[PDB]
Amino acid sequence: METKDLIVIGGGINGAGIAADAAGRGLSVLMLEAQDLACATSSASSKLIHGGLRYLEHYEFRLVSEALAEREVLLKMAPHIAFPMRFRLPHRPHLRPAWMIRIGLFMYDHLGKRTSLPGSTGLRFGANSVLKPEIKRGFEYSDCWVDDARLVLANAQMVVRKGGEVLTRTRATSARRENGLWIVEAEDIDTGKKYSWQARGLVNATGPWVKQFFDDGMHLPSPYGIRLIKGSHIVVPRVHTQKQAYILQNEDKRIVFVIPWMDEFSIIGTTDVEYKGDPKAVKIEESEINYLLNVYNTHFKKQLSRDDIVWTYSGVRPLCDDESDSPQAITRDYTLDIHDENGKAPLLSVFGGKLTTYRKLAEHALEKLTPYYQGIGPAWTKESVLPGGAIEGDRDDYAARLRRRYPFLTESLARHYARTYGSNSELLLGNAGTVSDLGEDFGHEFYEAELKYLVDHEWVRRADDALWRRTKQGMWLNADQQSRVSQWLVEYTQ
Ligand SMILES: Cc1cc2nc3c(=O)[nH]c(=O)nc-3n(C[C@H](O)[C@H](O)[C@H](O)COP(=O)(O)OP(=O)(O)OC[C@H]3O[C@@H](n4cnc5c(N)ncnc54)[C@H](O)[C@@H]3O)c2cc1C
Numbered sequence: 402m403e404t405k406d407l408i409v410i411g412g413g414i415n416g417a418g419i420a421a422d423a424a425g426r427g428l429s430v431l432m433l434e435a436q437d438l439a440c441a442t443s444s445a446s447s448k449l450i451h452g453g454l455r456y457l458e459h460y461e462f463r464l465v466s467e468a469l470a471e472r473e474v475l476l477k478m479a480p481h482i483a484f485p486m487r488f489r490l491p492h493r494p495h496l497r498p499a500w501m502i503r504i505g506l507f508m509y510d511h512l513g514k515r516t517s518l519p520g521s522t523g524l525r526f527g528a529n530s531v532l533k534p535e536i537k538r539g540f541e542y543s544d545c546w547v548d549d550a551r552l553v554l555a556n557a558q559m560v561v562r563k564g565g566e567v568l569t570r571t572r573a574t575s576a577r578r579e580n581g582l583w584i585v586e587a588e589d590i591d592t593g594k595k596y597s598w599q600a601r602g603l604v605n606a607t608g609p610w611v612k613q614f615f616d617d618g619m620h621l622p623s624p625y626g627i628r629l630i631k632g633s634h635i636v637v638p639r640v641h642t643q644k645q646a647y648i649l650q651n652e653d654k655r656i657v658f659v660i661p662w663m664d665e666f667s668i669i670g671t672t673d674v675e676y677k678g679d680p681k682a683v684k685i686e687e688s689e690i691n692y693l694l695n696v697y698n699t700h701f702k703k704q705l706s707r708d709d710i711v712w713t714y715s716g717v718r719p720l721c722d723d724e725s726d727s728p729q730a731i732t733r734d735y736t737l738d739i740h741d742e743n744g745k746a747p748l749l750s751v752f753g754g755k756l757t758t759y760r761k762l763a764e765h766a767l768e769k770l771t772p773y774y775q776g777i778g779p780a781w782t783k784e785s786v787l788p789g790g791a792i793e794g795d796r797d798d799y800a801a802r803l804r805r806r807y808p809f810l811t812e813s814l815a816r817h818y819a820r821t822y823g824s825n826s827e828l829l830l831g832n833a834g835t836v837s838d839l840g841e842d843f844g845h846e847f848y849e850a851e852l853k854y855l856v857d858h859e860w861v862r863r864a865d866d867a868l869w870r871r872t873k874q875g876m877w878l879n880a881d882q883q884s885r886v887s888q889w890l891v892e893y894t895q
Pocket residue numbers: 410411412413414415416433434435436437438439440441442443444445446447448449450451571572573574606607608609610614631632633671715716717718719753754755756757758
């Protein structure tokens with residue numbers, strides 16, 4: 402025994418969130434990830450903890466109000482990686498009447514009741530603004546930004562903290578009920594090593610693959626269809642010097658964001674394109690680029706071309722199929738299904754689920770698995786503080802406090818460590834007292850001490866994990882700098 406209480410198949414936001422919650426209730430948990438943590442949908446989002454302004458249009462109050470209330474919970478759980486942001490909504494009366502926005506903003510302000518985040522206002526835009534001169538009016542309100550891939554990583558760490566196990570580069574190949582228990586089989590994608598475990602409960606949190614795991618892994622009927630709806634984002638040198646995001650109303654009624662990113666760039670996204678095929682192959686396409694630049698170039702005076710684009714990414718939303726014609730009208734609320742046999746071996750499956758709502762998703766999932774467990778602790782995550790999150794304050798004021806005790810750190814490296822690692826920065830820096838104590842410089846102040854730490858404590862196995870998920874250093878390192886990181890990782894992980 403050898404028998405885990407719970408096995409979670411899935412290492413994106415919904416699987417890590419269920420595993421964490423369960424590990425902190427005393428269940429012995431094993432989370433399996435086929436490749437890396439956040440390697441799919443959860444590292445491809447617009448990176449927003451939002452209530453979901455556009456969803457009020459479709460009367461989605463369960464969701465918008467749940468999500469609104471969650472912004473402030475997440476903002477206390479993970480202040481290294483999440484923070485407040487203001488969004489400016491340019492006014493276009495031919496699409497939505499000023500009187501309507503005004504009603505929407507009120508509901509946004511009061512559906513979740515918020516003890517910290519500011520509140521909405523009107524705006525006039527002059528001849529000197531970033532917007533084309535015909536646009537003269539708007540609105541401003543609040544929502545939050547999170548480092549998505551990192552948030553998944555904070556939940557993986559929380560699982561290990563509470564005695565859970567997290568395997569990556571390990572793909573579950575089947576699950577079958579046998580004599581009251583699950584037999585789960587998995588296979589290490591590199592070495593071909595086989596594994597086999599028994600469990601009392603199973604979570605299918607594989608996201609875009611949820612129904613495929615029923616079909617191919619379990620030979621069971623799925624309770625819901627899934628619609629894959631691709632969205633892509635483009636990244637450009639920052640379009641302006643302001644700190645606010647803009648939310649733009651497009652002619653098709655879908656809103657597109659222009660979000661400041663890393664003090665240096667702007668992300669523009671996203672799109673809604675029905676998708677068929679391997680979710681691992683999703684890539685942005687020509688019309689998506691032309692679409693995103695069009696909505697941007699029709700609103701802002703500084704025009705962008707295709708040539709300005711420095712990076713793009715793309716993922717598929719796994720949305721619970723409510724059968725709507727238009728991909729943009731499909732619900733973003735999640736659905737959980739649970740089912741047992743002879744009152745044993747429950748299977749919880751997750752369909753849909755924003756990053757915003759994951760903790761509450763996870764709490765609902767444990768509500769449903771409780772009957773199967775003892776003995777089982779109560780809910781507890783609303784109170785906690787994710788690993789890295791214990792900064793006795795502000796991130797700009799942990800970055801100062803960090804450089805005060807490690808004053809060999811430049812202000813840019815302190816800012817990075819604080820905004821990435823938070824209170825884990827001391828575990829990374831260990832006993833270093835000079836810059837040369839940090840080891841090989843891999844480029845852009847990404848030192849061997851960081852890389853070693855990522856492997857030892859953040860499940861890094863390949864360069865992309867480190868450079869695109871655990872950090873966004875891949876934005877600055879050249880091709881030969883990146884193969885060196887992979888060379889070192891080969892040397893170290895031997
Ligand atoms: C374009 C876009 C923009 C978005 N913007 C936002 C937004 O800003 N705010 C917000 O809150 N949400 C946003 N989202 C929604 C959000 O990203 C997703 O809802 C969410 O991340 C779903 O995560 P998941 O865990 O359910 O799936 P994912 O986990 O991210 O993917 C499933 C995981 O399961 C693994 N897996 C699959 N099969 C197996 C197996 N056999 N064995 C082991 N592992 C397996 C995969 O490797 C993968 O890691 C956006 C989504 C899209 C794509």
